[PDB]
């Protein structure tokens, strides 16, 4: 559960990285 807790939080970090890209995408079209 401890090791998995890391792969989970990291997933929330990489996911949010695409969120910022989403706003930049909509702004283009």
mmCIF file as gemmi writes it, N, C-alpha and C atoms, coordinates in Angstrom:
data_model
loop_
_atom_site.group_PDB
_atom_site.id
_atom_site.type_symbol
_atom_site.label_atom_id
_atom_site.label_alt_id
_atom_site.label_comp_id
_atom_site.label_asym_id
_atom_site.label_entity_id
_atom_site.label_seq_id
_atom_site.pdbx_PDB_ins_code
_atom_site.Cartn_x
_atom_site.Cartn_y
_atom_site.Cartn_z
_atom_site.occupancy
_atom_site.B_iso_or_equiv
_atom_site.pdbx_formal_charge
_atom_site.auth_seq_id
_atom_site.auth_asym_id
_atom_site.pdbx_PDB_model_num
ATOM 1 N N . UNK Axp A 1 ? 0.843 -1.224 0 1 0 ? 1 A 1
ATOM 2 C CA . UNK Axp A 1 ? 0 0 0 1 0 ? 1 A 1
ATOM 3 C C . UNK Axp A 1 ? 0.865 1.256 0 1 0 ? 1 A 1
ATOM 4 N N . UNK Axp A 2 ? 2.033 1.166 0.63 1 0 ? 2 A 1
ATOM 5 C CA . UNK Axp A 2 ? 2.952 2.297 0.699 1 0 ? 2 A 1
ATOM 6 C C . UNK Axp A 2 ? 3.562 2.589 -0.668 1 0 ? 2 A 1
ATOM 7 N N . UNK Axp A 3 ? 4.071 1.548 -1.321 1 0 ? 3 A 1
ATOM 8 C CA . UNK Axp A 3 ? 4.679 1.696 -2.64 1 0 ? 3 A 1
ATOM 9 C C . UNK Axp A 3 ? 3.648 2.18 -3.655 1 0 ? 3 A 1
ATOM 10 N N . UNK Axp A 4 ? 2.433 1.647 -3.556 1 0 ? 4 A 1
ATOM 11 C CA . UNK Axp A 4 ? 1.354 2.028 -4.46 1 0 ? 4 A 1
ATOM 12 C C . UNK Axp A 4 ? 0.952 3.483 -4.244 1 0 ? 4 A 1
ATOM 13 N N . UNK Axp A 5 ? 1.039 3.937 -2.997 1 0 ? 5 A 1
ATOM 14 C CA . UNK Axp A 5 ? 0.684 5.311 -2.68 1 0 ? 5 A 1
ATOM 15 C C . UNK Axp A 5 ? 1.555 6.313 -3.41 1 0 ? 5 A 1
ATOM 16 N N . UNK Axp A 6 ? 2.717 5.857 -3.867 1 0 ? 6 A 1
ATOM 17 C CA . UNK Axp A 6 ? 3.644 6.718 -4.593 1 0 ? 6 A 1
ATOM 18 C C . UNK Axp A 6 ? 3.269 6.783 -6.069 1 0 ? 6 A 1
ATOM 19 N N . UNK Axp A 7 ? 2.965 5.627 -6.649 1 0 ? 7 A 1
ATOM 20 C CA . UNK Axp A 7 ? 2.585 5.554 -8.054 1 0 ? 7 A 1
ATOM 21 C C . UNK Axp A 7 ? 1.253 6.258 -8.291 1 0 ? 7 A 1
ATOM 22 N N . UNK Axp A 8 ? 0.474 6.412 -7.224 1 0 ? 8 A 1
ATOM 23 C CA . UNK Axp A 8 ? -0.822 7.076 -7.31 1 0 ? 8 A 1
ATOM 24 C C . UNK Axp A 8 ? -0.658 8.593 -7.317 1 0 ? 8 A 1
ATOM 25 N N . UNK Axp A 9 ? 0.099 9.111 -6.354 1 0 ? 9 A 1
ATOM 26 C CA . UNK Axp A 9 ? 0.334 10.548 -6.257 1 0 ? 9 A 1
ATOM 27 C C . UNK Axp A 9 ? 1.067 11.059 -7.493 1 0 ? 9 A 1
ATOM 28 N N . UNK Axp A 10 ? 2.018 10.269 -7.98 1 0 ? 10 A 1
ATOM 29 C CA . UNK Axp A 10 ? 2.783 10.638 -9.164 1 0 ? 10 A 1
ATOM 30 C C . UNK Axp A 10 ? 1.868 10.737 -10.379 1 0 ? 10 A 1
ATOM 31 N N . UNK Axp A 11 ? 0.83 9.909 -10.389 1 0 ? 11 A 1
ATOM 32 C CA . UNK Axp A 11 ? -0.131 9.899 -11.484 1 0 ? 11 A 1
ATOM 33 C C . UNK Axp A 11 ? -0.959 11.178 -11.472 1 0 ? 11 A 1
ATOM 34 N N . UNK Axp A 12 ? -1.161 11.731 -10.279 1 0 ? 12 A 1
ATOM 35 C CA . UNK Axp A 12 ? -1.927 12.961 -10.126 1 0 ? 12 A 1
ATOM 36 C C . UNK Axp A 12 ? -1.081 14.164 -10.519 1 0 ? 12 A 1
ATOM 37 N N . UNK Axp A 13 ? 0.232 13.962 -10.544 1 0 ? 13 A 1
ATOM 38 C CA . UNK Axp A 13 ? 1.166 15.02 -10.911 1 0 ? 13 A 1
ATOM 39 C C . UNK Axp A 13 ? 1.301 15.106 -12.427 1 0 ? 13 A 1
ATOM 40 N N . UNK Axp A 14 ? 1.464 13.951 -13.062 1 0 ? 14 A 1
ATOM 41 C CA . UNK Axp A 14 ? 1.603 13.888 -14.51 1 0 ? 14 A 1
ATOM 42 C C . UNK Axp A 14 ? 0.289 14.239 -15.199 1 0 ? 14 A 1
ATOM 43 N N . UNK Axp A 15 ? -0.824 13.872 -14.569 1 0 ? 15 A 1
ATOM 44 C CA . UNK Axp A 15 ? -2.143 14.154 -15.122 1 0 ? 15 A 1
ATOM 45 C C . UNK Axp A 15 ? -2.405 15.657 -15.164 1 0 ? 15 A 1
ATOM 46 N N . UNK Axp A 16 ? -2.104 16.342 -14.062 1 0 ? 16 A 1
ATOM 47 C CA . UNK Axp A 16 ? -2.308 17.784 -13.979 1 0 ? 16 A 1
ATOM 48 C C . UNK Axp A 16 ? -1.423 18.52 -14.978 1 0 ? 16 A 1
ATOM 49 N N . UNK Axp A 17 ? -0.32 17.89 -15.366 1 0 ? 17 A 1
ATOM 50 C CA . UNK Axp A 17 ? 0.596 18.491 -16.325 1 0 ? 17 A 1
ATOM 51 C C . UNK Axp A 17 ? -0.083 18.627 -17.68 1 0 ? 17 A 1
ATOM 52 N N . UNK Axp A 18 ? -1.001 17.708 -17.961 1 0 ? 18 A 1
ATOM 53 C CA . UNK Axp A 18 ? -1.744 17.726 -19.214 1 0 ? 18 A 1
ATOM 54 C C . UNK Axp A 18 ? -2.908 18.703 -19.114 1 0 ? 18 A 1
ATOM 55 N N . UNK Axp A 19 ? -3.324 18.989 -17.882 1 0 ? 19 A 1
ATOM 56 C CA . UNK Axp A 19 ? -4.423 19.917 -17.644 1 0 ? 19 A 1
ATOM 57 C C . UNK Axp A 19 ? -4.046 21.303 -18.149 1 0 ? 19 A 1
ATOM 58 N N . UNK Axp A 20 ? -2.831 21.731 -17.821 1 0 ? 20 A 1
ATOM 59 C CA . UNK Axp A 20 ? -2.334 23.029 -18.26 1 0 ? 20 A 1
ATOM 60 C C . UNK Axp A 20 ? -2.256 23.068 -19.78 1 0 ? 20 A 1
ATOM 61 N N . UNK Axp A 21 ? -1.957 21.918 -20.371 1 0 ? 21 A 1
ATOM 62 C CA . UNK Axp A 21 ? -1.867 21.802 -21.82 1 0 ? 21 A 1
ATOM 63 C C . UNK Axp A 21 ? -3.253 21.891 -22.443 1 0 ? 21 A 1
ATOM 64 N N . UNK Axp A 22 ? -4.257 21.461 -21.682 1 0 ? 22 A 1
ATOM 65 C CA . UNK Axp A 22 ? -5.639 21.493 -22.143 1 0 ? 22 A 1
ATOM 66 C C . UNK Axp A 22 ? -6.112 22.931 -22.329 1 0 ? 22 A 1
ATOM 67 N N . UNK Axp A 23 ? -5.784 23.785 -21.362 1 0 ? 23 A 1
ATOM 68 C CA . UNK Axp A 23 ? -6.169 25.192 -21.42 1 0 ? 23 A 1
ATOM 69 C C . UNK Axp A 23 ? -5.471 25.896 -22.576 1 0 ? 23 A 1
ATOM 70 N N . UNK Axp A 24 ? -4.231 25.498 -22.839 1 0 ? 24 A 1
ATOM 71 C CA . UNK Axp A 24 ? -3.459 26.08 -23.927 1 0 ? 24 A 1
ATOM 72 C C . UNK Axp A 24 ? -4.012 25.629 -25.276 1 0 ? 24 A 1
ATOM 73 N N . UNK Axp A 25 ? -4.578 24.426 -25.295 1 0 ? 25 A 1
ATOM 74 C CA . UNK Axp A 25 ? -5.15 23.861 -26.511 1 0 ? 25 A 1
ATOM 75 C C . UNK Axp A 25 ? -6.436 24.584 -26.905 1 0 ? 25 A 1
ATOM 76 N N . UNK Axp A 26 ? -7.345 24.73 -25.945 1 0 ? 26 A 1
ATOM 77 C CA . UNK Axp A 26 ? -8.62 25.396 -26.194 1 0 ? 26 A 1
ATOM 78 C C . UNK Axp A 26 ? -8.405 26.837 -26.645 1 0 ? 26 A 1
ATOM 79 N N . UNK Axp A 27 ? -7.37 27.472 -26.104 1 0 ? 27 A 1
ATOM 80 C CA . UNK Axp A 27 ? -7.052 28.855 -26.448 1 0 ? 27 A 1
ATOM 81 C C . UNK Axp A 27 ? -6.651 28.985 -27.914 1 0 ? 27 A 1
ATOM 82 N N . UNK Axp A 28 ? -6.133 27.904 -28.481 1 0 ? 28 A 1
ATOM 83 C CA . UNK Axp A 28 ? -5.712 27.899 -29.877 1 0 ? 28 A 1
ATOM 84 C C . UNK Axp A 28 ? -6.905 27.709 -30.805 1 0 ? 28 A 1
ATOM 85 N N . UNK Axp A 29 ? -7.88 26.93 -30.349 1 0 ? 29 A 1
ATOM 86 C CA . UNK Axp A 29 ? -9.081 26.662 -31.134 1 0 ? 29 A 1
ATOM 87 C C . UNK Axp A 29 ? -10.131 25.935 -30.296 1 0 ? 29 A 1
